[PDB]
Amino acid sequence: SMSVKKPKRDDSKDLALCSMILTEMETHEDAWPFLLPVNLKLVPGYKKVIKKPMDFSTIREKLSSGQYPNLETFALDVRLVFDNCETFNEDDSDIGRAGHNMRKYFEKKWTDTFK
16 A cells, blocks of 8 residues: 555566566467467458457567566467467367467466466
């Protein structure tokens, strides 16, 4: 509350670290369904079904242009990638599996880097 602050966590290296995690995800062999925005002209259903499209290239542009106010908002867009994947894909499909794999990969990096 007013004039009563918890001790100041060091956030100065967060931008660098998120970028590292993002490069590690960009270069994973299962990243291919997630590198670019889903083509809303060519995939029937996506536009209407998926309210907030998200992909890695869009996450990289936002990170590079100061569009993430903090590390929580960055984690949200990454999770959103995978939550969208689950909404539109059967678990028993290459893309559905990629999605589960990439989420697991991300959450490990996240915990190891920050908690």
